[PDB]
Every structure is written in structure tokens, then in C-alpha cells.
Design a protein around this ligand. Sequence first.
Ligand code: HEC
Ligand code: HEM
Ligand code: HEM
Ligand code: HEM
Ligand code: HEM
Ligand SMILES: CO/C=C(/C(=O)OC)c1ccccc1Oc1cc(Oc2ccccc2C#N)ncn1
Ligand SMILES: CO/C=C(/C(=O)OC)c1ccccc1Oc1cc(Oc2ccccc2C#N)ncn1
Ligand SMILES: CCCCCCCCO[C@@H]1O[C@H](CO)[C@@H](O)[C@H](O)[C@H]1O
Ligand SMILES: CCCCCCCCO[C@@H]1O[C@H](CO)[C@@H](O)[C@H](O)[C@H]1O
Ligand code: FES
Ligand code: FES
Ligand SMILES: [Sr+2]
Ligand SMILES: [Sr+2]
Ligand SMILES: [Sr+2]
Lengths: 175, 175, 256, 256, 430, 430
Amino acid sequence: DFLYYATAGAGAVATGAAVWPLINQMNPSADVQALASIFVDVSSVEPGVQLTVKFLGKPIFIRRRTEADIELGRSVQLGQLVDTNARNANIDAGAEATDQNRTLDEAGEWLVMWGVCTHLGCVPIGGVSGDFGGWFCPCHGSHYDSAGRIRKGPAPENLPIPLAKFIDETTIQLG
Amino acid sequence: DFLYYATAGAGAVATGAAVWPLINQMNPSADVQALASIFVDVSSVEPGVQLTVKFLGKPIFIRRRTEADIELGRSVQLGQLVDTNARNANIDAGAEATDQNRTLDEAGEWLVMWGVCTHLGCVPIGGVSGDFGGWFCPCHGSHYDSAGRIRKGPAPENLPIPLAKFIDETTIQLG
Amino acid sequence: AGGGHVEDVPFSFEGPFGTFDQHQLQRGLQVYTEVCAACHGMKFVPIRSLSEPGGPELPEDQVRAYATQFTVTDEETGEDREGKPTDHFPHSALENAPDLSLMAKARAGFHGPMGTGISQLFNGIGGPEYIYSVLTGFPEEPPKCAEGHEPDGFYYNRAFQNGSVPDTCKDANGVKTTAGSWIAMPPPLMDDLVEYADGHDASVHAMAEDVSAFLMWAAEPKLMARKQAGFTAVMFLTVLSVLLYLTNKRLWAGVK
Amino acid sequence: AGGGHVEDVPFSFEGPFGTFDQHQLQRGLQVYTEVCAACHGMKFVPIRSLSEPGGPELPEDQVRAYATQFTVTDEETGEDREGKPTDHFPHSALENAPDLSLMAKARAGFHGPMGTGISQLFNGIGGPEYIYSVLTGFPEEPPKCAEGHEPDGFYYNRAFQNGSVPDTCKDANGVKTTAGSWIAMPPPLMDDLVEYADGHDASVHAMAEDVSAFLMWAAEPKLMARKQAGFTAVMFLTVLSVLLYLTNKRLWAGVK
Amino acid sequence: GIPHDHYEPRTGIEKWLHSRLPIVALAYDTIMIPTPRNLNWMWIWGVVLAFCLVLQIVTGIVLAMHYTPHVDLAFASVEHIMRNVNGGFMLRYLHANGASLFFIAVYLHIFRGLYYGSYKAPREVTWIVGMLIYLAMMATAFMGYVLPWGQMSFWGATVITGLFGAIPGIGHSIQTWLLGGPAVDNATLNRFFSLHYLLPFVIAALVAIHIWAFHSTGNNNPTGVEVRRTSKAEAQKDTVPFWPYFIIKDVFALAVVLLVFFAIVGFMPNYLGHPDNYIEANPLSTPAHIVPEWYFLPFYAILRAFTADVWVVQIANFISFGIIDAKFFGVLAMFGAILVMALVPWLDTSPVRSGRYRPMFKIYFWLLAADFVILTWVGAQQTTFPYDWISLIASAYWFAYFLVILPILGAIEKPVAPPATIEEDFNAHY
Amino acid sequence: GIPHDHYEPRTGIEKWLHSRLPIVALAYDTIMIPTPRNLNWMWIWGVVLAFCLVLQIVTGIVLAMHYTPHVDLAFASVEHIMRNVNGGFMLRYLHANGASLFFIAVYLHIFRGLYYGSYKAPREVTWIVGMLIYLAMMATAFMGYVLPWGQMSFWGATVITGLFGAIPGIGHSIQTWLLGGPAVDNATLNRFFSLHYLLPFVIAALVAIHIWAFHSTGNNNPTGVEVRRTSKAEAQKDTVPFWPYFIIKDVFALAVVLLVFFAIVGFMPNYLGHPDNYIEANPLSTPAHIVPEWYFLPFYAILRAFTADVWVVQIANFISFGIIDAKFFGVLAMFGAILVMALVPWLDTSPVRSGRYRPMFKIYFWLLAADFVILTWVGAQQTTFPYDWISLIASAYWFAYFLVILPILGAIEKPVAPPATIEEDFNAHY
Ligand code: HEC
Ligand code: HEM
Ligand code: HEM
Ligand code: HEM
Ligand code: HEM
Ligand SMILES: CO/C=C(/C(=O)OC)c1ccccc1Oc1cc(Oc2ccccc2C#N)ncn1
Ligand SMILES: CO/C=C(/C(=O)OC)c1ccccc1Oc1cc(Oc2ccccc2C#N)ncn1
Ligand SMILES: CCCCCCCCO[C@@H]1O[C@H](CO)[C@@H](O)[C@H](O)[C@H]1O
Ligand SMILES: CCCCCCCCO[C@@H]1O[C@H](CO)[C@@H](O)[C@H](O)[C@H]1O
Ligand code: FES
Ligand code: FES
Ligand SMILES: [Sr+2]
Ligand SMILES: [Sr+2]
Ligand SMILES: [Sr+2]
């Protein structure tokens, strides 16, 4: 009786061994897995200069805020914002939308966020624009402050912040 | 009896009307039909300058021969050539490989021919090269004269001449 | 967003027996080349189709000379060259100017009544009739609610619906009180901005109609061929249906 | 053409239990970056695979810094930038320099005896062993029949077969009397042209072997993974065959 | 199992062939099956669906000879087909409108089966084989719409693939496996194209079992009274052979249907389409209105009708300890509409066959037919008032018909006496 | 038509299912057919061909989810599969070597049928269905080789498409129609990919008729003595049921075959390949040697064996007034090899079934088997001496076997008495 059962089990194992490669082939390719995260060299990024980087098809803004941009960010109160959520994957989801929580370092010098308007996914124009000294969306007229928070327009939420961290003194690991 | 036959005949006509579009779709597209012939503007082609043009995937050489290139062409006798066939689609296939038959005009000033080595289809280097003042194939070492006739190498035949003619004083219609 | 009003233009190509007016497509081609081409492009239209049947039907030499004005990067060499009929029209020179290859099929002019599709059934999609309403839909002054509050760099248009609106013109729940909205395209047409050879009318309305007719042909070159095929399939299937009817009748006559 | 002679190298990856030597692929990578890259490229090899298993297995930071030396045109922006691991190796800098991504599978080293394929059956295709014979196949002087008739800009090689030959070296019916032919590649390897970190031997023979092994991995990164899969399929099918044999015997025992 | 006459080989070529491969016999017994002679015009849609499947495969294969499944080339290859391929503009519109003809046919084919009780025994297997064909059809057309790679192609695929992320726990893995990446991209277009080629062949196999199914039990009729199979002299009174009586009746009706279909393709081929699909795929620009094609609208309405503030949704989220959020509820309700429709043999407890002799059922059926149109209409409307309530009343009645009304009706229905035979009903008309 | 026992529904689910759709009955009667009990190991190749067709379709569909049929992307998408897709390197080699496994199987399947006279009556229809499968296989594999778009892909397609130009008069139109242009280009790659997807499904349909064919007449055996069909008690002595006796025997032999095939794919997957196909398609550089894969070599040798100076070729060009040039003769001779092999039921006039009991035929058969290997070998050789003569003697003997030797042998053969029954031969061996 062992023989007629071992032959069936060995065939079922062989069937399963042949089916699983046919499923796993549809999982993300080795090149898609390699774009899960990227590394940016911010060695030559002075204050005030914006650095746009492609990630998962869409652009990410990496702006080194100046002395004036940080002042307007920390001056806004929590009641003046349309969306009080920070929209950051690093810290908890329940964190408030304070300027100290919208940056990676305690100094609030580096601002990393998705360059994707939450209204319908357009790319806002940077370099100090709009009516709040931040970003302006030309698709429908969404105004953002220097911290990247919605203040006027059809955009419901703030720009999300990806999982970012400084791996060393002059390199940021996005995702 | 006509009705049961007209109904069958009308159905067969409808089937045939539906089948022929399913065949003709595989004929060359409208963009391939437009490349059946091309027009070259030879308004700024001085003697001695070569003009390479793409046609049917392969290149065609259009060199305006100089006073020296035409002299070597008409000096070669018919017995000195390896291939005595002109390989021209305009004139008859039985025409001899004389220098007067390798050009479109009676003056023998314009030489139009396929820039495709008959050995295995490489592109010979132009601009007066080889051991005969013509073209040299770097793939295996096939030497051509100023008239485009094989004189030394694995190439069996001469370079074919396409269907070309002067539509006006400064335009050639290939094909 | 939603669907506003548009001017129903009696285009020649509309209806079952509708066909493009050859001279009209030629005029719109001139208006495209001299006005719209400055910002827009037609990346999908081959230049050689200007001599195709059922269209402008220019001689091939004119299209050959027309194609030379464009600068084209050769797909193989990489160096620029004069354009051939084999090349497509260039991309839009201006970034946010959408391509106009399929604009006459990418926008609907008629909607409603109540999402029931009764209007498009009897009026069509309204693509070429909506483009006419955008060009000729630039009024002199903005609405009253928008005086002194227009967004900088935009212009009011009656037909355009997918544009921003100032807060002064929105209602209590975000909906706009204006017919249209603010479009980023400046008014491109001016009276007699183009000089036609035969002295045809070149008013803004006449040019917007002709260029709309041309833009229809750019989206569908094979409009006239399709309607001949549609008419022919109806004739074959009408006869075959009538013969199959009588055959079904006589065949069931030996039962009923 | 045909198939000449080649040096049979005892590569480690050959045989059923063959695996790439990790240190050797690192040396061949150094020889590629410092010699072959000047003319050749690997348009199909991703740079990130230098840290993939079954290969050189470098740390990702070295590969990240290695990729920066290449200049790459961004697929989206169009402006040049420093290369990432996500990018492939550059194209061949020299036009007529063939790409080396798949060279170790695009050339056969062993043929015959009489077009019967018995040699390749026991010796393999001979790709990485043929490259070794081309690099080390540049003699001091040409053959005797070719003295004073070399084509300018070409160099004689013992292993290379698909090159031109002067008429002085051909027989009565076009066949060449030389072992190889004239290749457009100058002799790229010179003694001690590369200084390895661990002071390994850098002779012309040692470099040609290491770069050949590297070029095999470039054509098939998944060589080691395949042989484990091949070994595994043999184990399942060998056991299942033995069980199916005895099952067929007992099942047919009630007939015979 | 109706008494007919076997096939007899006649000529010499037929005797030579029947003794090796009786394919001429299988063609005779199949094309000479006794069919009831009282069939009305609602029995034509099987042949129209048969024509549709051939049309989609033929034009489908042709369009694949010129289409390139790649994001950089897909949209252009389709305009290459429209502009340059000989008659390619007609072949697309035949393939595009052909899906609408293919999908309007099943709904008349299906609502035929719902009225006349063709799903009730012994015809359960024909229904289940039918339902599987219905699933392969929708999955096929869905993946086909991705191939032009316009705005609706990209964003339609982005919404529907996101619904699989809403499954508890395993939802993210199934979405990643489907998409082949974090979002709809080229790997999605590349695999969707292959499966768009495959499933029509799978559908072709199911139609063979579908046709083997109703040939085994016999065709239903408007009365619901089965054919008499006690004597050949009786069956001949209830039935006529398929060939030539119903072959010509179906081929006639097909000619009339195509006379309309070609007029659509010939004069309004874009009426049933979305203009946004002539806009290239833009991942950084959501359209103003993401509308599926009309044949998917009623399932789109059921999805969006169950928002997070619906009372039934809030009850489920509380009971399930947060597992069933508002989105996953809409997913179950969207596919649940199919399941209750598949289980309708085991939910209709009435022993009466046709709905012609069920007075109370006849009311609820025609409300279902109207309810289907309403679901198809609100699917294109916004989530604002009053459309949020119209879809909620409409989505409710869909499940009430199958899960509540039909089981209850079997107990309280007061039917009407059907005819004694099909012969009675056929002679009552003539 | 062998006496067996009908299927009886056993459990309750089986009676519920058999009275609606007898699919469990068609599965029982099929898998319990009386098969002769003297079948040797040459009756396994039918099942090996069945496994191969599934392998090529399964791995075929997977590879299509990652391949791009475009000249600029085809070669790269295949190396994308090799380098990045999970297990894509194994799936390609399974698809590539699988075609070789698929083609070595038919030749053993076929040369089995030539020896044992399985082509002679009543099995003519099984043969013709077999031959059509053979054409779809070759047309399928040819178009599949174009898809990587290497050197051999491009130039192999350039030679074969040129043979259609050699047809008198209409040759240029068929070549233009095939290529979709003046030469092999992207339109050729685009349509060949579509038909490469289609024909494997068409092959699957032909295998259904193929299996319906020999089930009608019954399986041949090494003796050629048909099963006795006068009583159930007699058939049981000549035969055993398919399940489990020959299922386990064939599945056993399949495991041994795959044990070899996976070792090839696992350790020498490129032995059966051309290295030039790892070189991108170069229209401006012809390879030194354009070699088809091994399973096409014998037809390639017959093509090149008929040069313009062959005496038979010169006679044809003279008789036909120049219509049949040297090129068109090679085309006819290349496809003519298939035709004479298809007509072998009507060219073998011997009334004896198996070749086991035909002494003089047994010599000419094994010379054909050697002749097939020689044609496969010279197909890769040059046209120079002596290979021009070796292929010409080999091409000559191929037609002599079917057109001359086999008809003549039917009259002059002196056969040997076969056994009285299958029972005698089965006990004669053991
Ligand atoms: C730059 C000076 C322009 C010229 C001249 C013309 N167009 Fe244009 N157009 C331009 C922009 C920047 C935009 C985008 C507007 C926006 O708000 O996004 C457009 C848009 C259009 C459209 C699309 C309208 C829509 O509903 O999306 C159309 C149909 C259009 N433009 C037509 C058009 C024609 C016919 C022109 C020549 C007569 C023309 N435009 C000129 C920029 C510019
Ligand atoms: C391409 C798809 C289909 C084809 C080709 C097809 C074909 C047919 C045909 C030819 C018939 C014979 C009688 C008739 O014409 O009505 C039939 C009957 C039937 N079909 Fe379909 N059909 C398809 C889809 C479906 C679907 C989606 C369903 C249900 C979900 C279904 C359920 C039925 C039922 C219940 C019957 C009645 C059978 C009987 O009366 O015995 N079919 N079909
Ligand atoms: C059998 C049922 C089928 C259905 C319901 C169906 C449905 C669809 C739909 C809705 C589209 C979108 C058309 C558009 O809007 O442009 C499409 C496109 C397409 N289909 Fe199919 N299809 C079927 C069969 C096939 C088959 C068998 C093939 C095999 C090659 C195929 C190949 C294609 C291709 C290449 C496209 C893109 C080109 C185009 O859109 O015209 N289809 N299909
Ligand atoms: C996909 C390809 C094929 C498959 C799957 C297939 C399948 C089969 C199977 C399973 C059998 C019965 C078992 C056996 O004979 O080993 C069989 C028998 C046979 N096949 Fe095929 N076959 C194929 C191709 C062919 C070809 C190419 C030919 C001839 C040119 C052919 C002619 C025959 C013959 C003559 C028989 C014997 C019939 C009998 O004994 O009654 N088959 N085939
Ligand atoms: C009778 C069945 C089949 C045969 C004989 C066959 C044969 C072949 C062969 C010999 C190749 C060349 C392999 C290479 O050069 O790497 C190939 C390539 C290919 N085939 Fe098939 N094939 C079959 C079924 C299928 C099916 C059903 C599909 C699609 C669903 C398919 C898709 C492909 C693709 C995408 C390629 C190119 C990628 C590759 O070369 O691996 N094949 N085929
Ligand atoms: C690729 O998206 C295609 C769409 C389409 O309608 O194709 C014809 C589509 C477009 C926009 C939005 C969604 C779209 O897809 C779909 C698909 C769909 O399929 C189903 C049908 C019944 C039940 C469940 C589903 C799902 N999912 N139901 C609704 N919309
Ligand atoms: C795309 O070319 C594919 C080839 C191949 O062998 O694929 C497996 C091929 C390659 C190089 C040269 C020719 C090639 O194709 C073929 C195809 C072929 O098919 C036939 C088989 C029998 C009879 C006639 C033909 C033809 N034609 N017979 C010989 N060579
Ligand atoms: C519902 C089926 C009616 C038969 C088809 C007639 C459709 C005619 O419809 C007309 O077609 C014209 C052709 O371009 C369009 O221009 C018009 O806008 C549309 O109204
Ligand atoms: C005919 C059955 C063959 C069984 C498998 C034999 C495998 C030995 O074959 C060898 O495999 C080595 C694996 O690296 C390769 O290096 C050699 O090139 C190959 O010839
Ligand atoms: S898309 Fe950014 S505001 Fe409308
Ligand atoms: S290819 Fe031109 S000479 Fe060899
Ligand atoms: Sr109008
Ligand atoms: Sr070795
Ligand atoms: Sr509430």
C-alpha cells in the first residue's frame, strides 16, 4: 500500500513544483524590485535649491529650505491648516501636521515629500510660487505653503511624505 | 426555387465580402506603400561628393563622379570585368556592363546603385577607396571600381542598379 | 466637472451622407499651420495623408514642399533634416498644449439630458462642435463675479469646463456659477488673421469652423470610407434579411 | 566559414557541479572596466547584478559607486546624469565593436568532427573558451604567406575565423591556408596591464581567462541557479520514475 | 433524450467515412435535434452570442497582427491600425462595438432564462456553465480595454486592481501579483494582453460544454412544458427539427441584428465609447469621471452605493471587528451580485417552470429588468444626492430578488395551470 | 467498436449529474477503452506529444506576458525574461528545448506508424489528422523562432519567405502578402507572433479529433491483428483497459523522458541551439551559415540538393518551358516530401498490416530511417562536393520509398503468417 501512496504523493509534489513557478513569474521582476528604493547624493545641494527625483514613475521634491522658509512653516498654527494630518509613513499616522514633523532632521532643513498633488496627481511648480511662498498646482489652482501643506484649492489632503532617512551624512534613502 | 437559391447566393456574397478584408489587412500598410518610392533633392551635390540615402531598409549610393572617376570607368574593357552583366532594372537584363549603361544620363555623370555588397550584404566604404578607385568592402575585402563593378573579392556579381530616373532637372525618383 | 453649452454647427461631414468639404479642410490646414501649430502638434497624423483621398487631397508635390518647413531628427542618423511626407507632424511646441491629433474625438460637445444619452444619439459626440465653441467662446470681459480676481496667466472661456474658478464665483458648496471656466490658452483667433487665396471669409467664426472641420479629419481620416462601408453593409444585410425573411415564411408555411 | 582550433581552458563553471569562482569574476570585472570598456559595451547587463548572488557578489555600495563613473542620458529628463545600479552598462563606444553582453553564448569554440556535434556534446559550445583563444591568439609576426600584404588597420589572430585573408594566403579554390584571419581589434592585452588588489597574477594568459569567465556570467547570470534547478528536477523525476516503475510492475503483475 | 431517427450513411463517400470517424453522424444528430415549435424570438440570442464569439476572435487575431503591447507603443499602434492598416479602422470598431453587441446579447439571453425558468432543473449545469462563460467574458473585455492604453484604459485598471488590495490580509499580495509591481504599468499591460488572447479560447471550450448541455436535456420553451418523449408520433407534434426550421429562423434574426450593428459601426461607432480613451495614458492626471463601459455600469453602481456611512456597512464593520471596512464591503457586494445570480436555481423554490404562469413572480421580474436599467444608469452618475440613494434602493432590490423574494415566493405563489403539451400552446396561437 | 461495458452512475451525485450532462460517462468510457496488451515501448510517444503540447502552451502563455513583438524591443524583452523575470531563464529553455522534445517525439511517433502500418485502413483518417497536426507544428515552430529576432530569426525568415516568391506568376503577391512589405520587417514579426499564439490552440482541436479517430477504430498493435469484436469474452483476452494498466505504463515512460529533458535544460540547454541567434537581427550582415533547427534540417537538405545543374532539374525546366526553374523545383521537392508521406496509405498496396511480417519491406524501412538521419546531417553541411551528392542520393531515396518501392512491393512481397490473435502474440513473448 505504501507504493501506491508514494507514487501519488510524488506526482502531486511534482505538480505543485511545476505550478508554483507559473504563479511566481507574475510577481514583480528583478528590475521592479530594484526600484523599490533609491539613493540620492545630496553632496552638492545648497540651501534654496530644489532637487526633483523620479521614484516609482512619479517625481519627488527634495528642497533644502532656507532661513525664511522655515520661519513661515513654524509660525502657522494647527487651526489654520485645512488638513491637520502630517501624511508621513515614517512617524505614526496619528501625528499632527507640525513643521517639526514634516522634515527628517530636527533642524527642519531638509524637506522630502511626494511631488504629486493630492487633488488628481499633477506636479506643482516649485521655486517659491503661489500665494503662500511654496508650491502652486497649475491644473486647478491649489496653493501650498513652504512646508508643503494645502491652504487653498480642491486638494483634500497634504502632500504625502515617503519613507525616507539619512543613511549617512550626505545620502538619503527613499523608500 | 429562386428564393432558396438567392438566399444562399446572397449569404455567400456576404461571406466573401467579409473574408477579403481579413486577407488584405496583411498586405503592406499605407506607410509601407508610401516608401515604395522616394524623392532626393540633389540641388547641393557637387562632383566627388557621395550622398547616402536609405531605401527599402538598405542604403543607396548616389555619387556625382568627377572628371577622373568617369575616365577610369569608360576605360575598362568588357573582358576585364568579372561580371559582364549591368544588373539594371531599367534597361533589359541582357544589357552589357559598359560604363554608358551603368548611369541614367548619356553624360555618365550620375551613378546610382545599391550600396549593398553582393557577397553577403555589407556596406562598402566610399570616398575613393580600395585598389581600383571605387568602393571597398571591409567585411571580407571586396574591391570595386569607379563604375561600381566587382573586380576583386568574394562578391560574385556587380552592385544592382534600382529603377531610377530624373523627374526634373534636380530631382531623382527612385523606384 | 460636467457638460456645458456648445454651438451646434451644421458641419458638412455630419449625417449618414455627410462628407468633408475639400476646400474647407484646405482652409483649416492653413489655419492650423499659421496659428495653432505655434503651440499644438499632431504626433499621430502622417504628413503624407494631406494627399490621401477623402480629405484635403493636395497634390503630392505641395505636401512634399509643405513637409520641408518642419525640422525633423532622423530616426537613424540623429542629425536634423528637412521633413518628408513620411514623417508625422511635430509634437506640441508648448508643453501644456495638448496634442490635436484626436481632439475632435477626445472631447464631447453634447451630454445629458439626465445621463440618458439621448442628446448624443441625435446630435453625436459633439467633438468638432465643441472645439468651435472654445475658439469662439472668448468674451470681451470676464463675468461680474470674477472682476479683479482672475488667476494670473489664465483666460475665461465659455465652453471650457475643466478649468479653475475664483472663490468669488463659486457657490456655497464649491460649484461654479459661471458657464465655463478659466483656460490657459490665450484667444488664438483674430479677424482676418489668415489670408486665403480665394478671398474666402476669414472671420474668427469662419476660421474656427474650418479648422474644426480640419481637426475632425485629423482625428478620423477614414470618415468617408467608413460611411460607404456602413451604407454598403446595410444594403447587403437588408437584402439578405428580406430574403431570409421570405425563406423563413415559406419554410414554416408547411407547419402553420 | 567554419570552425578552427581553440584553447580548452579548465573553467570552474564547466561540468554539472560547476560554479563561478567569485574572486575570478571580480578580476574579470576589473579587466573589463579598465580595458574592454574603452571600445565594447554590455547593453543588456544591469549594473546592479554585480551584487546579485551567483556572480561577483559585490556590496551594493561599491556597485552604487561603480555605476557613477558611467554617464547616462535619463530616459525621462533627457539631461545627462551619474549612472545608478538600475542602469545597464553603456553601449559599445566603438561602432564596429560588437556588444559583449551575450558574446560567451554567441560564439562556438568546438565544432565537428564532421558536423555531427559529438564534440560540443562532450566539450560544450566553447564560448568562453573561444574568447580566451582570441585574446591570447595574437602572434608576434603574421604567417609567411601574408608577409607584406596585411590589410591596413587590421591584425592577424589565430582563433578568429570570420576575417579577410590576402589572396597570397588563399588556395586554388578560395579557402585560406592560415589558421585564423585578420581582425579589426588591436591586441588589447599586455603583460601586467592590470594591478590586482590581492597581487594576483596579471599576465596576458591570466587576464584573458578571468575576463572570459566574467563574460560567461554576463551572458548567463543564472547559470548556478539553473544547475540547481536541473539537479532538483532530476531528483524528483528519478524518484518518481523508480516509484512509477515498481508501480507499473506490481500493477502489471496480475497479467503477465 | 427525445425520440428522433439515427443517421444512416447514404453515398459511398459517407460509408467510407462513417466506419472510421462518425463525424457526419455527430453533425446530423446535432443539427436535427427535436426543438419545440413554440419558441418565440427570445431564443435567437444564443446564435447571436455564437456569431459574436467568432467575430471577436477573427477581428481580435487580425488586430493582434498590428498591435504592440507596450506603454510606449500601444496607443500609437492602435492609431497605426486606424490610419494605415487596410480597413483597420473598421476592424477596431467591429472589435470595439462587437463587445457591446456581445454583452447586450447575454443580458437578453440571461433575462430570457430568468423569466422562463430555463435555469431550473434539469438545466442547472447549462446555467453554471453559462455563469462561467459570463465571468470569462467580463474578465476578457476588461483586459481588452487596457490595450489601447488611453486614460480610461489606465485608470479603469487602476481602480479595479485596487479593489483586490481591499481584501483582508492577502489583498496586497494579490494586487502586487496581479499588477506585477506597485501600480498599473507595462508588466500589467504585457500580461493582460496575453490573457486577453487566451480566455476567448477558454470561452470557446465552455461554449462546447454549453452546447452539449442543452442538447442533452433539450431546449426549453415559453410554456415550460417539456417535450413528450414516450413515442415518436407524439414528439413530432411538440417539435420540429433544428435544421432547416430554426436554423433559418435564427440566421434570419441574426441578419436583422447585424443590420443594426453595422449601422452603428458605420455611422455612430463612438457613441458607446468614452472620448477620454483617445487621450494617452497619464498616470499624473486623473480624469474628471472614471466611467466603465455600459455593460459594466450596473456592477460599478453596486460598488459605489455602499459607502462607509451606509447603515448596513456600519453594522458589518462593527460586527467583523474592523475586518470588513467600507471598501471591502463594496467588493463583496459587487461580486456578490454575480453569485446570487448563479445560485438562482437553488433560490427559486417554485416548482413552476416558466414565469408565464406565475402572477406574483411576474411583477418582481419586470422590476428586476427595470432595476437593471437603473443600476446601469446610476453607474455613470456622481456620488452626490439623490444618486447615492437611487443606487442604494437599486442595489438592495437586486439582492432582495434572489435571496429573499424568490425563496419566499415558492411558498406563497398561487400559480396558473400551464398547457397540457407544447402542441396545445402552438395551436392556440395558430 | 470493441465490446466493453457501459458506465453506471454509482453515488447520488453521479446520478444527479449523468441525467443532465453525461461528462463522467464520456470520461469513463474513454479512459476504459480496451487496448491491446502487446503494445511495446513505441506506443508511449502519443502521450509524450500530449505532455509537450501542454508544456509549450503553458510556458508559451507565460513568456507572452513578458515579450514585446516589436523589432526595437523583441530581442531585449527576451533577455529581460532571461535576466529579470522570476525563473524566466528556466521557462524559456523549457519552451525552446520543449519544441525539440516536441519534434523528436513526432518522428518516433511517425516512424512507429510507418513500420507497424498504422497508416493503412481503417486508420486513414487518423493519419490525415496526424499530418495536419504536423503542418501546424512546423508552421508554429518556424514563426516562434522569429520572435527573439536574432540573426537566425531574421535570416531564417528571409530565406523561407523568399521561397514563396519562386511560385510562377503569383509568387511575388504571396510573399508581399506574407511579409506585409518588400522584406522581412516589423510587420512580419507582429503577425507571426499572433499566429504563433493561434496555431497551438488549433493543434489542440486537431488532437481532439486525433483522439476521437483511433478511439473509433481502436489502437493498432505490433502484430497488426485487430481485436476480436464478436464477444466480450474474446476482447478481454486480446486487450486490457487503458486505465490503470497503460496510463501507468505511459506516465512511467514520460517520467523517464523528462528525466533526460530536464537534464538537458538544466546542464546543456544551448546544445540544440544556434549561437548566432544570441546576436541581434542585422539586415546588413548575413551570417556565414544559415542553419535551421535540427527538426527542419532534412527538409532543408532536400531544398538545396536540387541545384540548377541537376539532370532531373534540367529536364523539368526544359519540359515546363522555363516555368519550373531551379528554385521552384526545390520548393516542390521540399513540400513534396510531406505529400508523399501523407499519401502513404494509398501508396502502400500491400494488404499486410504490420511491417514485422514483411521481410523485404523491413530492409527498405530501416534504410529510410538511416536516410532520415543522413538528410538531417547534410542539411547543416555546405553545398560543395561530396555533400551535393550525398543529399541527392538521400533526397532520391526518400521519394523512391513512397512513390516507387512501396507500390511495387505490394505485388512482389512474400509475407509471413501473422499470429491468429493478439492473445497468441502476448503469450508468445512471455
Ligand atoms: C499658445 C499661444 C496656443 C496656441 C496659439 C493655440 N493653443 Fe490651443 N491650447 C494651448 C494651451 C496652453 C492649452 C491648455 C489649456 C488648459 O487650460 O489646459 C490649449 C488647449 C486647447 C484645446 C483643449 C481644450 C480642452 O478642453 O482641454 C483645444 C481644443 C485647443 N487648444 C484648440 C486650439 C486651436 C484650434 C488653435 C488654433 C486656432 C489653438 N488651440 C492655438 C495653447 C495654445
Ligand atoms: C458566448 C456565450 C454564449 C453562447 C454562445 C450561448 C449559446 C446558447 C445557445 C445556442 C443556446 C440554445 C438556445 C438559445 O439560443 O437560447 C443557449 C441556451 C441557454 N444558455 Fe446560453 N450562450 C452563451 C452564454 C450564456 C450565459 C452567459 C448564460 C447564463 C449565465 C447562458 C445560459 C443559457 C441557458 C439557461 C440556456 C437555455 C438552455 C435550455 O433551454 O435548455 N448562456 N445558449
Ligand atoms: C472573445 C471576446 C473578446 C472580447 C469581449 C474583447 C474585448 C475587447 C475590448 C472591449 C477591447 C477594447 C477595444 C477598444 O476600445 O479599442 C479589445 C481590444 C483588443 N482585443 Fe479583444 N476582445 C475579444 C477577443 C479578442 C481576441 C481573441 C483577441 C486575440 C488576438 C483580441 C485582441 C485584442 C487586441 C489586440 C486589442 C487592442 C486593439 C484594439 O483596441 O482594437 N481580442 N478587446
Ligand atoms: C501533437 C501531436 C500528436 C499527438 C498529441 C498525438 C497523439 C496520439 C496518441 C495519444 C495516440 C495513441 C497512443 C500512441 O499511438 O502512442 C496516437 C496514435 C496515432 N497517431 Fe498521433 N499524435 C500526434 C501527432 C501525430 C502525427 C504527426 C501523426 C502522423 C503523421 C500521427 C498519427 C498517428 C497514428 C497513425 C496513430 C496510431 C493510431 C492507432 O493505433 O489506431 N499522430 N496519437
Ligand atoms: C505547438 C506549440 C508551440 C511550439 C512548437 C512553439 C515553438 C517555439 C520556439 C521553437 C520558439 C523559439 C524559442 C527561442 O528561440 O527562445 C518559440 C518562441 C516563443 N513562443 Fe512558442 N511554441 C509553441 C507554443 C506557444 C504559445 C501557445 C505561445 C503563446 C501563448 C508561445 C509564445 C512564444 C513566445 C512569446 C516566444 C518568444 C520568446 C522565446 O523565444 O522564448 N509559444 N516558440
Ligand atoms: C480596464 O478597465 C476597464 C473598464 C471597462 O469598463 O472596460 C470595458 C473600466 C473602466 C473604468 C472603471 C472600471 C472599469 O472596469 C470595471 C470592471 C468591472 O468588472 C466587474 C464586473 C462584475 C463584477 C465585478 C467586476 C470587477 N472588478 N466592473 C466595473 N468596472
Ligand atoms: C524563422 O526561421 C526559422 C527556422 C527554423 O528552423 O526554426 C526552428 C529557419 C532558420 C534558418 C533557415 C530556415 C528556417 O526555416 C525552415 C523552415 C522549414 O519548414 C519547412 C519544413 C518542411 C517543408 C517545407 C518547409 C518550408 N518552408 N524548413 C526549413 N527551414
Ligand atoms: C440607432 C441606429 C440608427 C442607425 C444608424 C444611424 C446613425 C446616424 O447618426 C448620425 O451619424 C452621423 C454619421 O457621422 C453623425 O455625424 C451624426 O452626428 C449622428 O447623429
Ligand atoms: C543525453 C543526456 C545528457 C545528461 C546531461 C549531461 C550533462 C553534461 O553535459 C555538460 O554539462 C555541463 C554542465 O555545466 C556543461 O558544462 C557542458 O557544456 C555539457 O556538455
Ligand atoms: S490636480 Fe493638483 S490641483 Fe487639480
Ligand atoms: S560582405 Fe561585402 S565582401 Fe563579404
Ligand atoms: Sr451639428
Ligand atoms: Sr573547457
Ligand atoms: Sr449617520
